[PDB]
């Protein structure tokens, strides 16, 4: 029996790693389970397009084509059905036209200025598929869903003859008071960090850089004497989103002293060193760092395979 505890700031990818265990070690999500997520996919989609439209008013961005104004009105009139797990052909057309608008896209490309689900584009770009009648969420669709974690979730699964008891909690500031309820008998901690968070601010505090928040938390956890004998695994997650973002958003926004280029390898390594340097006992405390894309089953399968070997050893 092994106890794994997933920690990290909000939206770092903790719950997604949990979902992967079911896909990798279990038979994946069944049709009935996938159908349960259909309303989540729809909710996520409607919420995302509305978030952008909301930002347009805040940032004073006009629609590319005046005709979209009518579609925007219809969006709210028809939104309700989507919230109930139903996607009419009419609603799909409205969302599709809005998503393709140049003004909506201009705002979309300025998302760091507000709050937007990372899976926004994933679903919006696949509207035709998810809008089909009798649509059934794929494994990737489930993995891409956004469901805030409040409280503690316990998941069980067997791997390499070991009985894993995996726990994940909420990462927002208001949820951290609950972390201590999971501190007993932890075999290993998997601390998740959203690499693509470097130019974002906390949803609970617009004055705090998301990455700096993750650093303070890791510093606290990694150096907690209570975990001296607990394996510390560091997941520098969302490497896929980071790879694209680093090309156009200065890392100096988060780390003023970064002197490297706008490239993945140099920046990724820099961030890794920033976190690993927080370890106050480098000689007696080992940090096992892995770069991950939590929604990529193949990546997680191999990374988790490596993580389990370390745990076994
Ligand atoms: N593109 C991408 N999306 C990710 C990745 N990890 C998580 N996500 C998405 O980001 C969102 C938040 O993850 P979630 O697991 O709910 O975060 P938690 O609050 O730490 O549990 C979900 O919509 C995920 O599907 C990743 O590596 N790449
Ligand atoms: F940390 Al979360 F949903 F934001 F589990
Ligand atoms: Mg969660």
Domain extents for the chain? 1-29+149-313, 30-148
Which residues lie across from 237 on neighbouring strands?
A: 194
Q: What angle do CA 227, 231, 232 make, to 5 degrees?
A: 85
Contacts of 194 (CB under 8 A, 6+ apart): 8, 9, 11, 12, 13, 210, 214, 237, 238, 241
> How far is residue 144's CA from residue 141's CA, in Å, rounded to a whole number?
5
Q: What is the end-to-end Cα distance of the chain in Å, rounded?
A: 14
Which two three-digit tokens encode residue 54?
């909301």
Any bridge partners for residue 209, and if so which? 201
Task: Tell me which of 3.10.310.30, 1.10.540.10, 3.40.50.300, 3.40.30.10 is the CATH number of domain 1-29+149-313.
Answer: 3.40.50.300
Nearest C-alpha neighbor of 6 from the set 200, 217, 210: 217
CA torsion, ordered 115, 120, 124, 126, to nearest 10 deg: 180
CA distance 109 to 43: 21
Rounded to an integer, what distance in angstroms lies between the CA atom of residue 57 and that of residue 297? 38
CB–CB of 191/7 below 8 Å? yes
- Cα separation, 310 vs 312, in Å, equals 5
User: Ligand 1: residues within 6 Å at CB?
Assistant: 8, 10-16, 117-119, 143-146, 149, 171, 192, 237-238, 240-241, 293-295
Rounded Cα gap, residues 42 and 182, in angstroms = 33
Total count of residues recorded for the chain: 313
Residue 55: CB atoms within 10 Å: 20
Torsion of CA 246, 248, 254, 255, to 10 degrees: 70
Which of 28, 236, 64 is CA-nearest to residue 142? Answer: 28
Report phi then psi at 233, rounded to 5: -105, 130
In angstroms, rounded to a whole number, what is the distance separating the alpha carbons of residues 161 and 4?
15
- The reply to whether 1-29+149-313 and 30-148 are identical in fold is no
Query: Ligand 3 center to residue 6 CA distance, Å?
Result: 9
The domain made up of 30-148 has a fold known as: GI Alpha 1, domain 2-like (1.10.400)
- The pairing of strands 287-291 and 201-202 is unpaired
d(CA 25, CA 152): 21
Query: What is the distance between the alpha carbons of residues 273 and 263, in angstroms, rounded to a whole number?
Result: 16
Q: Is the dihedral of CA 119, 122, 126, 129 positive or negative?
A: negative
Q: Classify 74 as helix, strand or coil.
A: helix
Ligand nearest to the CA of 296: 1
Residues marked active site are found at 11, 16, 146, 168, 172
User: How open is the CA angle 133-137-139, to the nearest 5 degrees?
Assistant: 155
Helix, strand, coil shares, percent, the chain, to 5: 50, 15, 35
Closest ligand 1 atom to 192 CA = 20
What span, in angstroms and rounded, lies between the C-alpha atoms of 216 and 218? 6
Give the SS3 label for residue 160.
coil
Is 143 among the annotated ligand-binding positions?
yes
Single out the residue of 71, 109, 106 nearest to residue 90, CA to CA: 71
Q: Which of the listed residues 123, 151, 295 should we mutate to test ligand 1's pocket, taking the one with most ligand atoms within 8 A of CB?
A: 295
Measured CA to CA, the distance from residue 99 to residue 52 in angstroms comes to 9
CB 163 within 8 A of CB 28: no
Contacting residues for 68 by C-beta, under 8 A, at least 6 apart = 97, 98, 101, 103, 104
């Amino acid at each position: 029996e092994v106890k794994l505890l997933l920690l990290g700031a909000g939206e770092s990818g903790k719950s997604t790693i949990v979902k992967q265990m079911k896909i990798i070690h279990e038979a994946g999500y069944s049709e009935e389970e996938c159908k349960q997520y259909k309303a989540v996919v729809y909710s996520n989609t409607i919420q995302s397009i509305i978030a952008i439209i909301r930002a347009m008013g805040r940032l004073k961005i006009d629609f590319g084509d005046a005709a979209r104004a009518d579609d925007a009105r219809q969006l709210f009139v028809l939104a309700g059905a989507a919230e109930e797990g139903f996607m009419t052909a009419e609603l799909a057309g409205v969302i599709k036209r809005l998503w393709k608008d140049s003004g909506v896209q201009a705002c979309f490309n300025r998302s760091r200025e507000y709050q937007l689900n990372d899976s926004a584009a994933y679903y919006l770009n696949d509207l035709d598929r998810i809008a089909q009648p009798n649509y059934i969420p794929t494994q990737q669709d489930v993995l891409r869903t956004r469901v805030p974690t409040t409280g503690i979730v316990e998941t069980h699964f067997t791997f390499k003859d070991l009985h894993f008891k995996m726990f994940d909690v909420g990462g927002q500031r208001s949820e951290r008071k609950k972390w201590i309820h999971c501190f007993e008998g932890v075999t290993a901690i998997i601390f998740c960090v959203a690499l693509s968070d470097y130019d974002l601010v906390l949803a609970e505090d617009e004055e705090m850089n998301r990455m700096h928040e993750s650093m303070k938390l890791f510093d606290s956890i990694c150096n907690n004497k209570w975990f001296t004998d607990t394996s510390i695994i560091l997941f520098l997650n969302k490497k896929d989103l980071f790879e694209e973002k680093i090309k156009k958003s200065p890392l100096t926004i988060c780390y003023p002293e970064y002197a490297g280029s706008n490239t993945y390898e140099e920046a990724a390594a820099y961030i890794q060193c920033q976190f690993e340097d927080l370890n106050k006992r480098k000689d007696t405390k080992e940090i096992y760092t892995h770069f991950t894309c939590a929604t990529d089953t193949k990546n997680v399968q191999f990374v988790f395979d490596a993580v389990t070997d370390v745990i076994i050893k």
